[PDB]
Design a protein around this ligand. Sequence first.
Ligand code: ZN
Ligand code: ZN
Lengths: 166, 165, 164, 166, 165, 164, 27, 27
Amino acid sequence: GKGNFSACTHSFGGTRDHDVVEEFIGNIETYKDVEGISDENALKGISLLFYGMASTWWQGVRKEATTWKEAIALIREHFSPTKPAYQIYMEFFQNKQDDHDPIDTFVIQKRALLAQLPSGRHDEETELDLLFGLLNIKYRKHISRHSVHTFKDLLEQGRIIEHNNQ
Amino acid sequence: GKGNFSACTHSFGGTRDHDVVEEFIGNIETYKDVEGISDENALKGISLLFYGMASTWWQGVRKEATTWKEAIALIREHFSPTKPAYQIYMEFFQNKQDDHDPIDTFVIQKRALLAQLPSGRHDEETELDLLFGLLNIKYRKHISRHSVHTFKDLLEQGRIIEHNN
Amino acid sequence: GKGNFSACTHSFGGTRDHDVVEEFIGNIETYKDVEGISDENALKGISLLFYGMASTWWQGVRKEATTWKEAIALIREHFSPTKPAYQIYMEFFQNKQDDHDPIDTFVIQKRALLAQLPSGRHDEETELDLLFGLLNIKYRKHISRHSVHTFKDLLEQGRIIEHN
Amino acid sequence: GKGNFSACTHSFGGTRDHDVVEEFIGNIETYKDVEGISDENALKGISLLFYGMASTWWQGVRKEATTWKEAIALIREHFSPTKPAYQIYMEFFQNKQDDHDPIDTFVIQKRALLAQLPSGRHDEETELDLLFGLLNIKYRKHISRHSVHTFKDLLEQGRIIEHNNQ
Amino acid sequence: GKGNFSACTHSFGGTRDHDVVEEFIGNIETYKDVEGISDENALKGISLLFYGMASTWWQGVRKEATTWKEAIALIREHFSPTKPAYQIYMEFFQNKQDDHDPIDTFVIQKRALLAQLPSGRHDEETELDLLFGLLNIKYRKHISRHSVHTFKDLLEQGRIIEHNN
Amino acid sequence: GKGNFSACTHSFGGTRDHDVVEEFIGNIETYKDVEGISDENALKGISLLFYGMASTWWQGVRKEATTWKEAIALIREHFSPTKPAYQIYMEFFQNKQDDHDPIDTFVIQKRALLAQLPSGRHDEETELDLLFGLLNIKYRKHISRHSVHTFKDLLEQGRIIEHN
Amino acid sequence: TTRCTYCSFRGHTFDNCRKRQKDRQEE
Amino acid sequence: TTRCTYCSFRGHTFDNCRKRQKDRQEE
Ligand SMILES: [Zn+2]
Ligand SMILES: [Zn+2]
């Protein structure tokens, strides 16, 4: 299954946010792994994925690279610093649950913010312990910490306690 | 024997209902069967379909999946709860038919709401006996309960009573 | 062949009339026969065509369907009631053709509506004798019932009289 | 190159004009000749090209046909009579050229109306003779019948006489 | 090795110019070269592209064609006349440049209008000598005719005279 | 391979700036090199990319082009004039960076604009000494010219000072 | 330039488009 | 039902469409 980058529909501009750079790097890497392009052939044709605001920057620093990993690391370094751990822990305990959001959206967002720490440092139990201190008073007064036995149960008891009109 | 999902027009933003999740899962299945993509080469590309809240949700739970079957099971499990027994019975007796509604739509809705109970729990006779007690007065003054059996006849008597009026 | 309905453009709603349901069933059958799909494989894919109210109706009665024949039988029986004779006789003889309607459009509808009666109860002669009582004064003054015999010559004489 | 009618995008309704029926029959015949479908296989699947207003008519007269030519002739007979010659000759001499249209559009329309007569009954010279009696006075007073030598010349002299601002 | 033109987005309604006919003929050529359709199998399908006046025109002249080459020649011949010699020279001297127009657009237009004469009839020197006598007073008061040769220099002197002002 | 430009999405108008023409020429060259099109075959298809005023310009000078190299040479020479030095020196030192512009955006533009001078006339030291005279008061109070040496450390110290 | 309003293709105008005129659209 | 206003496909809404959001459109 020979191929190259010519057909790809993804592209990246000069935006200086974080989510855009992360989604772009992830999509490009998954495409390169799925279509079977060679590990070195891709570097010779990467220039077809840049707008008019970043092409000058790529022209300015082409020679400070030799293999694909260095180029991806260089993009990440210049356009958006990676988050260190302490800022993640700081963000997790800031905004406590409001008085209107359903439990499902809260659990989804908190789980989405907790996967960015290095893998294997936290198994299921301590994660459930960290999450349990911020729930709003409507749920804490019925369900307790005696019986949770992982996440799948907490959503179930929360849904049954939510259908009952509080 | 290879390809991405990038060509599709379907996307699932996340809403707690049944018809939307069912139609989306069916369209994705037909697409994967038609373009020939294989099972383990297909899971890697699944991320391109989700958007909005569904993207954050898939970013959450990802290490619990391993093959295509687990992914469909997780989507169906988290985005369309199975209603327990008693709520269906409670929903069933809280909505009598109005004066302005043909027999067909009413019987079709009340039948569609009854198939979610566990299979084999009911007989055609007991179900039809349950269906009465809600029909509006315009139809109950003619057809009698001991002159009908299967569902094929109630629609017939209702149509003849409707056309005369 | 490509044993699935995935390429089809046909669809069906909740409408209640003989013509739409008839053309729908005929198109699905001819598509099943021309492209070589297997007799049994089609049933798993039938659910992809319905939309709106029809999807709820199909959710209501999946348990009874088994093979390919009974599904079309269920469609025709729940959306195609065998109208009893007297309503058909009343619906015919209503709405005499107006001055503007051409002879061909009027003849094709009145013959399509006369096929729902039980089979074999009428020959061509009595059928044409029934039809020859609603044409306007314009077409009737020239042709006369003794002239035309079969059910085809009336179209020819009507076309030649309608040319002017 | 096996195939059938399933993929065709052409279709026909119940309209009772003439140009629609002619264009439809021509497109369907050219498609059947180009894609190589068998001469009898097409008749078994012709029903996929009709709307809801003509499908009842096709259901009503299916049995009075046996081969493809009879079916096309039957469609032409029921939905739109073919034009006999005398009406064509009558239409040709009705509306003389106006006082504003350029010569090109007039020659194009008159040539379009003259190809429907049976082929080989009229060669180039008599056709040029028939066309020449209806031109507006602006052109008849310069170019004459002495030199025409077929159509390509008449358009040329007319264009040079038209660029000169009359 | 077979297929119809039905998939295309191009259509030619008939207008007496040059750019439209050229772009349309080029797009049709690239399409036929890309999808692999052969020459004699392609002429039969050509009717689907035309619409409006072009359809009646193709219905007119059809027996004079036999292969693809004759069809392109007929379209080019009937829908884009070749202008004779004298009209180009007349058009060329009836439009002096205005005060508000950069040198580049003017030189590009006047050069584009001169290539329709038969090839080999002119020298670079005589053409550049013809080009003067129309430049507006803002530029003729500095650059002198005996200080320029090829077209590469006139643009240079015009740019330096423009940036100073 | 598919020896034609038919699949390309790139286009070019009549704009006059270094960046657009540069990115256009670079994209066309990389596309010509990656997909294996022959060195000579591309020239016949080059006309399908231009639009608007550029098409008229290409109509004006077809006679001079011959092979693949001279076409890009003509584009760069008619749309890419080699700016003389003094205008570049005047354009630099104009528009001192404002309070809002981040250090990375400002550094990349000022270095991209300094490459048009004739090659080899300046080493890294004098270049950095020229650049270090337009930064705002905010970044200058902490770092000092004796500290930074090469052209890379300034970005690091600026980022750490910009984090707060 | 003049991108077809309906099909979003740069090849023609609103009045005439294959999807809109035929292909049993306009229902 | 709710045919996508731009791409003319029955699969989503105006706000989010592959051609309009990205694919270097909105020029
Ligand atoms: Zn369009
Ligand atoms: Zn869309």
